[PDB]
Coordinates of C-alpha atoms and ligand atoms in Angstrom, one line a residue:
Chain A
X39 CA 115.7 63.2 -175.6
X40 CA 118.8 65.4 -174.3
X41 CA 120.7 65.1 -177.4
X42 CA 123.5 66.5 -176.6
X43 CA 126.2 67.5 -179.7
X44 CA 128.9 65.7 -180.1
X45 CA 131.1 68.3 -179.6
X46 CA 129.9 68.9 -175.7
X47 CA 129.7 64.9 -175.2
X48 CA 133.5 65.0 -176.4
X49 CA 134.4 67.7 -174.6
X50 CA 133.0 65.7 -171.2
X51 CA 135.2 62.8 -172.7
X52 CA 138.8 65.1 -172.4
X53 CA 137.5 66.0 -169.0
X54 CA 137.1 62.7 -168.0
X55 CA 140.5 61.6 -169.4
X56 CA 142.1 64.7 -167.7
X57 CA 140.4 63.4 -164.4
X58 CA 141.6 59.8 -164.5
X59 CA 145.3 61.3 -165.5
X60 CA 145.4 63.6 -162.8
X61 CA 144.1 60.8 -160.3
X62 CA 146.9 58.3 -161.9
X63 CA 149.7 60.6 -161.0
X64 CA 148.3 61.5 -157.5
X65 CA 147.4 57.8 -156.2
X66 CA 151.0 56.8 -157.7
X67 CA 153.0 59.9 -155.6
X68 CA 150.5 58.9 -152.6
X69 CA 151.3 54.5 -153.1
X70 CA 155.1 54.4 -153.8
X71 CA 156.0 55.2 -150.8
X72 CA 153.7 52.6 -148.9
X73 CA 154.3 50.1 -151.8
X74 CA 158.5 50.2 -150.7
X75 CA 157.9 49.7 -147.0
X76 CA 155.9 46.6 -148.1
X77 CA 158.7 44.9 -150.4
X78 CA 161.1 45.9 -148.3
X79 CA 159.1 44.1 -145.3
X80 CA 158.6 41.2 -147.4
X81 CA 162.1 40.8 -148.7
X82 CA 163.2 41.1 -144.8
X83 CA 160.8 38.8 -143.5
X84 CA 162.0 35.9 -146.2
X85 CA 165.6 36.8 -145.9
X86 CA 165.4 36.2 -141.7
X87 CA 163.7 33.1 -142.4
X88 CA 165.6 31.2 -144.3
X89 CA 168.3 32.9 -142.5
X90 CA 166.5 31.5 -139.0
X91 CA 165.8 27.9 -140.5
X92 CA 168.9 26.3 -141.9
X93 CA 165.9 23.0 -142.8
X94 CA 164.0 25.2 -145.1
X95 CA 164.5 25.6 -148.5
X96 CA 163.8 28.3 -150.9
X97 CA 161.9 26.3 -153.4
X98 CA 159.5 24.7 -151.0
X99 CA 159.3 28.3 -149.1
X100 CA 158.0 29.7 -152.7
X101 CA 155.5 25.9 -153.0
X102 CA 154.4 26.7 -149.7
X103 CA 154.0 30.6 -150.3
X104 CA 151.9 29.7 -153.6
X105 CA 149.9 27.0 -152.2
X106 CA 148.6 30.1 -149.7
X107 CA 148.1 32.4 -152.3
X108 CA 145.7 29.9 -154.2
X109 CA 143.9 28.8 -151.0
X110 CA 143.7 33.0 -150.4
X111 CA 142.4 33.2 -154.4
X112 CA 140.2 30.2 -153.1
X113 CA 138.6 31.8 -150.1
X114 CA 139.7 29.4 -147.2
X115 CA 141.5 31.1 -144.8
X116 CA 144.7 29.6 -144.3
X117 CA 145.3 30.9 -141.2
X118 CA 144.9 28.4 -137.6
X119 CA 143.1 25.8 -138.4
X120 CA 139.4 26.2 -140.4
X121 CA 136.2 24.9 -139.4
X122 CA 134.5 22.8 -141.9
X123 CA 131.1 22.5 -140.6
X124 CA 130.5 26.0 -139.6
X125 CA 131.4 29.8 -140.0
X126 CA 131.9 29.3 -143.8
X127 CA 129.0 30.1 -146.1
X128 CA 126.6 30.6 -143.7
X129 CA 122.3 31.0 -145.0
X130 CA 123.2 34.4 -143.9
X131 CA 126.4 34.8 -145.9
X132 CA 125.1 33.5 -148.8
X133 CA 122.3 35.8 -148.6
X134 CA 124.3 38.6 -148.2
X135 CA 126.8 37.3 -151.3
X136 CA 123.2 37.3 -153.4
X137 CA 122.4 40.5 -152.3
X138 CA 125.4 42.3 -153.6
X139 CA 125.8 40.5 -156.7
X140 CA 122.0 42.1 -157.4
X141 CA 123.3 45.7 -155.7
X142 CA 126.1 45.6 -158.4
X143 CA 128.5 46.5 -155.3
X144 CA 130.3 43.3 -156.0
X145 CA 133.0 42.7 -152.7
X146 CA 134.7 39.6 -154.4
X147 CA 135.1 38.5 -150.7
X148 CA 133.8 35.1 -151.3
X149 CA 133.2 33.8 -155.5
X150 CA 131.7 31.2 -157.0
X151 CA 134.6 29.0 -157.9
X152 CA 132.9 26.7 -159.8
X153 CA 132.0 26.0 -163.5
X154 CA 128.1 26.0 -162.7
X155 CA 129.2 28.9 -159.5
X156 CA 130.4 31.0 -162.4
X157 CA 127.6 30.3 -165.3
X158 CA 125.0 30.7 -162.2
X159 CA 126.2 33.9 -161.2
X160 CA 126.2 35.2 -165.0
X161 CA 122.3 34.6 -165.5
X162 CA 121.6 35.4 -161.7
X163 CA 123.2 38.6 -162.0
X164 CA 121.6 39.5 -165.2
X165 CA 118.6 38.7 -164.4
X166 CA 118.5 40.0 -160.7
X167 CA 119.8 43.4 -161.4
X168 CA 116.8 44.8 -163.5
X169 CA 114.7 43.9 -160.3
X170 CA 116.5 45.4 -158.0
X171 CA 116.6 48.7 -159.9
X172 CA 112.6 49.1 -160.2
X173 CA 112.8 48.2 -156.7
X174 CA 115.7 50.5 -155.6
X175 CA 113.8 53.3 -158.1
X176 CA 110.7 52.5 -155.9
X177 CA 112.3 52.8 -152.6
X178 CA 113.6 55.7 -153.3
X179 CA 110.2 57.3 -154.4
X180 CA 108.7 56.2 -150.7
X181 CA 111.7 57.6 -148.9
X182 CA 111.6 61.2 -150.4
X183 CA 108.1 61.0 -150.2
X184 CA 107.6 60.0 -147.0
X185 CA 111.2 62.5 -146.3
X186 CA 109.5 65.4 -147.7
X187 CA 106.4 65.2 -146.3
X188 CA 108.3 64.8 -143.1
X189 CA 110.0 68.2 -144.0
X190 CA 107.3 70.0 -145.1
X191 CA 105.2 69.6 -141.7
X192 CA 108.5 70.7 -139.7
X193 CA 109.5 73.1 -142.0
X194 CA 105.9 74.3 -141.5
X195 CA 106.0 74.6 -137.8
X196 CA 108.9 76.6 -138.5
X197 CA 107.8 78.6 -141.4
X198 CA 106.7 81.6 -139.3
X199 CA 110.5 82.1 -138.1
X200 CA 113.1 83.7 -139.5
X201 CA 111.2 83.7 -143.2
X202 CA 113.5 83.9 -146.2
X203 CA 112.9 82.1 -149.7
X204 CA 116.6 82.0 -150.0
X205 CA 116.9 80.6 -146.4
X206 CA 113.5 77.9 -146.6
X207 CA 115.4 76.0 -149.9
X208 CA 118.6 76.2 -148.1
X209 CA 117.7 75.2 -144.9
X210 CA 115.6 72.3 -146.6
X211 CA 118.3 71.1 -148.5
X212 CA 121.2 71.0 -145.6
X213 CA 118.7 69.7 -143.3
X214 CA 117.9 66.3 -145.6
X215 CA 121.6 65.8 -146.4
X216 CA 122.4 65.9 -143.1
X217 CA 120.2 64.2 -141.4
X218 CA 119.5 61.3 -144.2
X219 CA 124.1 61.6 -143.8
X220 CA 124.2 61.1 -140.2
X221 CA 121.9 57.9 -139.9
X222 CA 122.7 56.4 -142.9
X223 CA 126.4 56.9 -142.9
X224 CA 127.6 58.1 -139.5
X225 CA 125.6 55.6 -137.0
X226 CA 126.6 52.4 -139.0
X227 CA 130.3 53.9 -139.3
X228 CA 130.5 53.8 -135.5
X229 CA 128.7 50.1 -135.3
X230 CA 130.9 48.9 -137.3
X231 CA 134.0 50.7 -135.5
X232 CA 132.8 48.9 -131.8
X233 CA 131.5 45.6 -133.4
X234 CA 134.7 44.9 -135.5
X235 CA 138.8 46.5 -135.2
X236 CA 138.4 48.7 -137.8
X237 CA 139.2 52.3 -137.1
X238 CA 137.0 55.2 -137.6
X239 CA 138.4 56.4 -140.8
X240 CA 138.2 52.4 -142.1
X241 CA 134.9 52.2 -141.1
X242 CA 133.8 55.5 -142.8
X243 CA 135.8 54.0 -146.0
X244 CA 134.1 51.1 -146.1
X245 CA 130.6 52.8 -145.8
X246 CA 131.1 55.4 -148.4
X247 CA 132.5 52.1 -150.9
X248 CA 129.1 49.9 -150.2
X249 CA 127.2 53.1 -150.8
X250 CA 129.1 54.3 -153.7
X251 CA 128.5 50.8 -155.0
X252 CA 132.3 50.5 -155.8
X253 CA 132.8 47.3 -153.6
X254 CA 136.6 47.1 -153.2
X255 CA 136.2 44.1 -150.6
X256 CA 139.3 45.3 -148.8
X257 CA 136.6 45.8 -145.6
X258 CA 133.7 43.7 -145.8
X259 CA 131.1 43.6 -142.8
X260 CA 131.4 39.9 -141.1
X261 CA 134.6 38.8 -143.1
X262 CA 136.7 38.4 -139.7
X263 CA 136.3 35.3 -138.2
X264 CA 134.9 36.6 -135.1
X265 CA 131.5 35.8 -133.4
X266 CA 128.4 37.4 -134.6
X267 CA 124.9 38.2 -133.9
X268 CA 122.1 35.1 -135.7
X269 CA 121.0 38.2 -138.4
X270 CA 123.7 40.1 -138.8
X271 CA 124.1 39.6 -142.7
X272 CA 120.2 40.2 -143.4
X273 CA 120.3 43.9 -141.3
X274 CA 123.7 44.9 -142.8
X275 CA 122.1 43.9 -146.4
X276 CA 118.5 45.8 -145.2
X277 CA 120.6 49.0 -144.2
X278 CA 122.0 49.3 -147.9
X279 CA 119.5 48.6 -149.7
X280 CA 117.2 51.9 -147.6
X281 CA 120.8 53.5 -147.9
X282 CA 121.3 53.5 -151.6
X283 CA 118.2 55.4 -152.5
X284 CA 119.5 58.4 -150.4
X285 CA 123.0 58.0 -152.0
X286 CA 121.7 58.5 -155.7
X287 CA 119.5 61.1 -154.8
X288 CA 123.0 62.7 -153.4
X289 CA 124.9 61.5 -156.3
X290 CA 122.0 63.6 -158.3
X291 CA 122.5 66.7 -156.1
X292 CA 126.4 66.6 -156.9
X293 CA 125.5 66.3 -160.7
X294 CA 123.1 69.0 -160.2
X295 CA 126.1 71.0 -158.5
X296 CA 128.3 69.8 -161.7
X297 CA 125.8 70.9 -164.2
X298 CA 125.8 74.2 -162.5
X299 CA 129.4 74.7 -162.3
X300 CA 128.7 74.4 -166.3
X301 CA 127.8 77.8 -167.2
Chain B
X41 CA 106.6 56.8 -158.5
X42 CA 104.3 53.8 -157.5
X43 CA 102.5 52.7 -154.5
X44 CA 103.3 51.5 -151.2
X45 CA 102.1 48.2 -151.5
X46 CA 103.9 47.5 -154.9
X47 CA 107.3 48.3 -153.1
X48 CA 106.5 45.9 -150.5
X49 CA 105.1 43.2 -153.1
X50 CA 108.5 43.8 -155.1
X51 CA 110.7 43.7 -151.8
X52 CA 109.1 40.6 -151.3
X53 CA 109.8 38.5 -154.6
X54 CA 113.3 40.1 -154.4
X55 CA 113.7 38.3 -150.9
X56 CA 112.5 35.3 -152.4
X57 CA 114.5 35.4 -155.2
X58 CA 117.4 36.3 -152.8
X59 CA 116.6 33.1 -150.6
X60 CA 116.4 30.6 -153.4
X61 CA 119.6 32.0 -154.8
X62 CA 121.5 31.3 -152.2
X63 CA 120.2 28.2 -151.5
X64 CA 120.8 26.6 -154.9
X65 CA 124.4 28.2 -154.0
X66 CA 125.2 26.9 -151.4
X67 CA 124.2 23.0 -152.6
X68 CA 126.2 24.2 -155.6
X69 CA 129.6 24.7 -154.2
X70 CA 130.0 22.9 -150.8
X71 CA 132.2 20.1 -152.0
X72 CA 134.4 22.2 -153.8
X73 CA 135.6 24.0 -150.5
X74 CA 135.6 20.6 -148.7
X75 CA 138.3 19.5 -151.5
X76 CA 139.9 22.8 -151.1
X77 CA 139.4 22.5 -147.4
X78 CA 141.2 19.3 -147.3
X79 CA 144.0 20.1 -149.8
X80 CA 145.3 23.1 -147.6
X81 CA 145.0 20.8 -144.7
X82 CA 147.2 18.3 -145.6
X83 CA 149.3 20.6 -147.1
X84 CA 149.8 22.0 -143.5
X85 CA 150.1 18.6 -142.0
X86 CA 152.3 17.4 -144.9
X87 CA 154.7 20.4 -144.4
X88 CA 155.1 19.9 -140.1
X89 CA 155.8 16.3 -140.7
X90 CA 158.4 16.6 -143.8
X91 CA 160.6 19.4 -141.4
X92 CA 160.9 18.8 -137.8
X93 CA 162.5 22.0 -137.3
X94 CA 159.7 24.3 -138.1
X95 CA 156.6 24.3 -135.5
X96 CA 153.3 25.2 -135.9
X97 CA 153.8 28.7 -134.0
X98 CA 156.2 29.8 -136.9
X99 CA 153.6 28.2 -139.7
X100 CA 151.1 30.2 -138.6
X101 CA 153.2 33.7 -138.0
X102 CA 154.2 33.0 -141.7
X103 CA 151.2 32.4 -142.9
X104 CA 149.9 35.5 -141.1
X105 CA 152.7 37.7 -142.6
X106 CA 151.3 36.2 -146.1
X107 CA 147.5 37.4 -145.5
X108 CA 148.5 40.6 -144.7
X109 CA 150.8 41.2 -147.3
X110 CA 148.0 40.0 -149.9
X111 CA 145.7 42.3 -147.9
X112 CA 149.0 45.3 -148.9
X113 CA 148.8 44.0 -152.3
X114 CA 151.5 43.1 -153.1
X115 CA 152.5 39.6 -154.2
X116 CA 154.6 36.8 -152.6
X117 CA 155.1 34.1 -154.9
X118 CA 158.2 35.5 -156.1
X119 CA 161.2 37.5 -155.6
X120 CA 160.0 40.8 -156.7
X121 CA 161.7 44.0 -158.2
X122 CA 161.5 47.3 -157.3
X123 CA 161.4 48.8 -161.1
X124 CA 158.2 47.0 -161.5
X125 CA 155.0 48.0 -159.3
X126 CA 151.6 47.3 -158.9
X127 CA 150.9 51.0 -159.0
X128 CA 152.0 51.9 -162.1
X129 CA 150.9 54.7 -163.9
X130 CA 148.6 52.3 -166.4
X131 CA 147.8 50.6 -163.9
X132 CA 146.8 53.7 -161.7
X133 CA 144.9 54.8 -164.4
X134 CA 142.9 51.6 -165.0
X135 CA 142.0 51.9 -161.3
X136 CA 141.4 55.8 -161.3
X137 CA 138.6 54.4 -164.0
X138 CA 137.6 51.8 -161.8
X139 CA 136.4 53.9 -159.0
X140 CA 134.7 56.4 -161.4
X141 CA 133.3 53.4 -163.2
X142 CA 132.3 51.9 -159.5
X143 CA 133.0 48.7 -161.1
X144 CA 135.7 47.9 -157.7
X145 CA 138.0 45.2 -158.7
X146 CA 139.6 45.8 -155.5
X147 CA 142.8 44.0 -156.4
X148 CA 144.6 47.6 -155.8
X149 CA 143.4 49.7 -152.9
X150 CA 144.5 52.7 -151.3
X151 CA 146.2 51.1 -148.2
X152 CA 146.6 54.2 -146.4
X153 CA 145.0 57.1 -144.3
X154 CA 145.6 59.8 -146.7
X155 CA 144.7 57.7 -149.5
X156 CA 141.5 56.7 -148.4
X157 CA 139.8 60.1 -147.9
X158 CA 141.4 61.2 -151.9
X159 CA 139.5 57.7 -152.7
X160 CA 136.0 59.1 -151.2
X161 CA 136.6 62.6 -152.6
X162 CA 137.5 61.3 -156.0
X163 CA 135.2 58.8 -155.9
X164 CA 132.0 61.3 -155.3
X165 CA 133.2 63.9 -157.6
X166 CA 134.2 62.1 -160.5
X167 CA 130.9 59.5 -160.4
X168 CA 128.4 62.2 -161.4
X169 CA 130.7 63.3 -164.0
X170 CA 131.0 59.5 -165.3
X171 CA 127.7 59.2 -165.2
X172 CA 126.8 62.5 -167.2
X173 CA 129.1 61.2 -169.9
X174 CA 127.8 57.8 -169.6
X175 CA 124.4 59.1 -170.4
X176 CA 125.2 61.5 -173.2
X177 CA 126.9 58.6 -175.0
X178 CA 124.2 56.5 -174.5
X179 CA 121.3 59.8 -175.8
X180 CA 123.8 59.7 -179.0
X181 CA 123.8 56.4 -179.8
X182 CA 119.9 55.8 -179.1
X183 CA 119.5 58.6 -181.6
X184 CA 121.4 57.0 -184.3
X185 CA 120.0 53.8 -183.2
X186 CA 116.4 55.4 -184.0
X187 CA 117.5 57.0 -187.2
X188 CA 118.2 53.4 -188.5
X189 CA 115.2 52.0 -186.8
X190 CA 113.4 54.7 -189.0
X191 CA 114.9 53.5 -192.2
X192 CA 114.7 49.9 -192.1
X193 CA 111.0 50.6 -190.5
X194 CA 109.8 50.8 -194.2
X195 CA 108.4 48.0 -195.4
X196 CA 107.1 47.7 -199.0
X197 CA 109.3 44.4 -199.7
X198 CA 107.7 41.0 -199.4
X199 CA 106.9 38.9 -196.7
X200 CA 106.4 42.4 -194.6
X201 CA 104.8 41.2 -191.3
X202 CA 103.8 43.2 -188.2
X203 CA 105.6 46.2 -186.4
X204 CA 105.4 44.6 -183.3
X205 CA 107.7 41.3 -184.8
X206 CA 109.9 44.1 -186.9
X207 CA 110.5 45.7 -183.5
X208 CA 111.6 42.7 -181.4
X209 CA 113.5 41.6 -184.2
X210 CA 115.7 44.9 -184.4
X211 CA 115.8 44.1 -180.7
X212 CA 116.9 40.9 -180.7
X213 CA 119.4 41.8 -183.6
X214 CA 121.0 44.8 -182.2
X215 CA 121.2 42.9 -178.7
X216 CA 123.0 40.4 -180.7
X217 CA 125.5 42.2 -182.1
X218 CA 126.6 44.1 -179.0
X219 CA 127.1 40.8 -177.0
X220 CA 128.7 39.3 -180.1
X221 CA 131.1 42.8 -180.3
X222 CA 131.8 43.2 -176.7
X223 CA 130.7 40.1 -174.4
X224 CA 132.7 37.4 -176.9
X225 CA 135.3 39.4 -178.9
X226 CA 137.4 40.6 -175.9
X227 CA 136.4 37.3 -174.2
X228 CA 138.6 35.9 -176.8
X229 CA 141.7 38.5 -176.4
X230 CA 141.5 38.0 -173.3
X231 CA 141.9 34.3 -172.9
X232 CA 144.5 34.2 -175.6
X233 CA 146.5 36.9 -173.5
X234 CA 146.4 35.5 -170.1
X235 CA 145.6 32.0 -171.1
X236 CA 142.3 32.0 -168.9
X237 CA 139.1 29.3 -168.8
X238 CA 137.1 29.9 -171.9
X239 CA 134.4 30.2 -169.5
X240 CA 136.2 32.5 -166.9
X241 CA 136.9 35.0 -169.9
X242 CA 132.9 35.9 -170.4
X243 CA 132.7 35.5 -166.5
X244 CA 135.0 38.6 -166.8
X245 CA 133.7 40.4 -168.7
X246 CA 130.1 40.2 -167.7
X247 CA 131.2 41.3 -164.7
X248 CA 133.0 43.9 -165.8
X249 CA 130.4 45.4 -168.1
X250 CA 127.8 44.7 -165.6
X251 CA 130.2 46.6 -162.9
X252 CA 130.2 44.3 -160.1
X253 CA 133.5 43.9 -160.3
X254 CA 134.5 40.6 -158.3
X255 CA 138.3 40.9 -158.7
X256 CA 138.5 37.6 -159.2
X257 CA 139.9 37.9 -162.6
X258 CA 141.4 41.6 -163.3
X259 CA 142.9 42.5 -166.6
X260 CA 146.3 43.4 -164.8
X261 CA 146.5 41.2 -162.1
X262 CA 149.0 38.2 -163.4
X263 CA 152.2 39.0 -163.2
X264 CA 153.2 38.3 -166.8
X265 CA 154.5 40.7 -169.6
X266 CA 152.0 43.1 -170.9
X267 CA 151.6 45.8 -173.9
X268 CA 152.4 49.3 -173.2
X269 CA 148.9 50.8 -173.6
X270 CA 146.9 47.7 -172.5
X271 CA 145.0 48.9 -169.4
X272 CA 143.9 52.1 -171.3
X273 CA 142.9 49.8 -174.2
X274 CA 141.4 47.9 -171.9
X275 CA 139.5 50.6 -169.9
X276 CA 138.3 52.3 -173.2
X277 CA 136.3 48.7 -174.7
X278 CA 134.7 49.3 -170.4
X279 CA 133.7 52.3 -171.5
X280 CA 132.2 51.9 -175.0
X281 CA 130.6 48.4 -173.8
X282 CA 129.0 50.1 -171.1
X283 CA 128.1 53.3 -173.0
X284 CA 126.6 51.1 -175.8
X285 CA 124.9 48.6 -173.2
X286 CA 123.6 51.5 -171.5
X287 CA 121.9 53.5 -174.8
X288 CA 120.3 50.1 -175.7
X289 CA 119.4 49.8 -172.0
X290 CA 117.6 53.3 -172.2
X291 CA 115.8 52.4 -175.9
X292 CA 114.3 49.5 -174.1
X293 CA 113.2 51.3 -170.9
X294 CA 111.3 53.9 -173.3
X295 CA 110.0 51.9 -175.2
X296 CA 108.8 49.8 -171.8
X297 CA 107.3 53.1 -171.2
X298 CA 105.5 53.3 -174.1
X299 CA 103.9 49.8 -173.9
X300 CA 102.8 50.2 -170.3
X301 CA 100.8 53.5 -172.2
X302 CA 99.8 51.7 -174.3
X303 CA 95.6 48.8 -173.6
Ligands
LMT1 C1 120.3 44.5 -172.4 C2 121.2 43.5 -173.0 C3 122.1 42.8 -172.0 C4 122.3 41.3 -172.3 C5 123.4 40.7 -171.5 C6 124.1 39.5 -172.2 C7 125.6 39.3 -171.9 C8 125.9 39.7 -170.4 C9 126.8 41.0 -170.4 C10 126.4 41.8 -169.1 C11 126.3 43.4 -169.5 C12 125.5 44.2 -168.4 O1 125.3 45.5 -168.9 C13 124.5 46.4 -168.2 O2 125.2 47.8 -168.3 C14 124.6 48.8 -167.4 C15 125.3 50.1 -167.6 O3 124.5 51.1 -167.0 C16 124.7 48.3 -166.0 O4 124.1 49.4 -165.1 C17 124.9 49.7 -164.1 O5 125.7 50.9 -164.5 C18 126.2 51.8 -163.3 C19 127.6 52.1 -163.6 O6 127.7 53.4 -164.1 C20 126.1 51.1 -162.0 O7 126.4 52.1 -161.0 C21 124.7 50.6 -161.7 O8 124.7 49.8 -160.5 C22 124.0 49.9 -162.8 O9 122.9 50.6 -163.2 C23 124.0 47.0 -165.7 O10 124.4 46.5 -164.4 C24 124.2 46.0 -166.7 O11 123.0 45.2 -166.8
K2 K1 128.3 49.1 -159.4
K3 K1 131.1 47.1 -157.9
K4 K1 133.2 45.6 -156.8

């Protein structure tokens, strides 16, 4: 029972609409730019077509353009020449489409597209997610258990060394952020970069998005069509689900930070 | 905090669950992407035959130049123009929100190197802070929600029957009124402004309160005329349905508490 008055809450409220303001006007200075190249590519590439191709014809160009976007809307790749009986949909895939629609992380990669896909995925959703958060809340008990007690016998070899109190909480909390960091972030960052074309800095995008739970879907492990290992969906779905717990607890040592920051 | 055994008992229904899922998922929605499957095939074909001219190289260059640019974001079903942007500053704002929110539409994404790292910093320093208001809006609204608890609680009228039927009846009631005030009511706007599936505008918006955040449907996405204010409209009813959603999620989770006290 916080209770917080309702002048602090709405004070968090201006802060938050300050935040979102000032990220508006960044991201727009940062995407015009970017955005401009892209029409201007576009623009060029149509123009030297139908420049090119005296046969083809703007309005079938546009049918042909929008037929693409709805089979891109759709999920089949329109690109070469798609295999129905395999790649597509996979017992893996699936899986791992169930597994974030529970996780919340939502990559909109592949959809339902379906009247009874759709009302499915409403009453799966709502009824997976409670699940997965006593589950995620359990998880995440055993790991800092099991993390701590780890700590607390190394810490206790070391204890005789160098003794500070100031030092023992710091030490203890740079060593779990970094080493929970570097294996849950930094070793599948660098799978990722030699299994698939992404670069480093993608890679390390895309982690910190599935961790965050945002989900953008602009990188999404397995959505090239490329070959893969037989379990490749089930270990990339195991590695979130043991990653997540460690992101909230760092997600409550940034609040923590916040809250501080407050006096 | 629970045992070790009870994690693995609930990893293993969630599995199960998982598995069923996407079994009934897949059965589900095979033959729609054969029919799609087949429409964009002879679509292809029907396009080679009908120009002689244009080969299949060139096709698929095109088409290539088309993924991409939906993977840029920007669209190319028609001519565009440069006053008008994706990232506009409603629009930027709306995202900004987004990736506070982790909800992760993913329609509009950073799309650049520079861009991507202010995504992860804003993205880890503005989530606690969400979350911090998220919480103190859902403490303020679970403490009016008790006060009125507390005053229909009395009971001297007749036909007065147990606590335990008063109780899920304020439940049920309450539960009813947000879904009715925030699950059908913009479902409503919505299809009336975009002219969307009476089923694809709850689809919507239980994804968006529930923050998964698909992208298949996004509030700004179609390229038609839109109010001034309508993405911060928009993003405020996210934020009161998920505020509200969460205090009722929190009155339920206590009182859970209290009933696993309680025999
Ligand atoms: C309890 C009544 C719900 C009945 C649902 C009937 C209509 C369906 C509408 C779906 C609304 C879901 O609303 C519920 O909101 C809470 C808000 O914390 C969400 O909870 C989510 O919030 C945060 C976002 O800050 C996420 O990072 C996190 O993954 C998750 O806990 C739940 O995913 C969802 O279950
Ligand atoms: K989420
Ligand atoms: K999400
Ligand atoms: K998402």
């Amino acid at each position: 029972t916080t209770v917080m008055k309702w002048k602090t809450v709405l004070a968090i409220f201006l802060l938050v609409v300050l935040y979102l303001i000032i990220g508006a006007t960044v991201f727009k200075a940062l995407e015009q730019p970017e955005e401009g190249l892209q029409k201007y590519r576009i623009i060029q590439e149509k123009i030297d077509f139908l420049s090119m191709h005296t046969c083809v014809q703007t309005s079938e160009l546009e049918d042909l353009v929008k037929q693409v976007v709805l089979a891109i809307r759709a999920g089949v790749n329109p690109s070469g020449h798609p295999s129905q009986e395999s790649s597509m949909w996979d017992l893996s895939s699936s899986f791992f489409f169930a597994g974030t629609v529970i996780t919340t992380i939502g990559f909109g990669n592949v959809s339902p597209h379906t009247e009874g896909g759709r009302i499915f995925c409403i009453i799966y959703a709502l009824l997976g997610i409670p699940l997965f958060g006593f589950l995620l809340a359990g998880v995440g008990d055993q790991l800092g258990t099991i993390f701590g007690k780890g700590i607390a016998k190394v810490e206790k070899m070391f204890v005789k060394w160098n003794v500070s109190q100031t030092k023992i909480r710091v030490t203890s909390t740079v060593l779990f952020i970094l080493f929970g960091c570097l294996l849950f972030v930094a070793l599948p960052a660098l799978i990722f970069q030699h299994i698939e074309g992404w670069s480093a800095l993608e890679s390390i995008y895309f982690v910190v998005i599935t961790l965050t739970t945002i989900g953008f879907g602009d990188f999404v492990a397995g959505g090239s069509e490329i070959e893969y290992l037989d379990y490749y969906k089930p270990i990339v779905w195991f590695w979130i689900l043991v990653g997540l717990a460690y992101f909230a607890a760092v997600l409550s040592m940034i609040g923590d930070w916040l809250r501080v920051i407050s006096k």
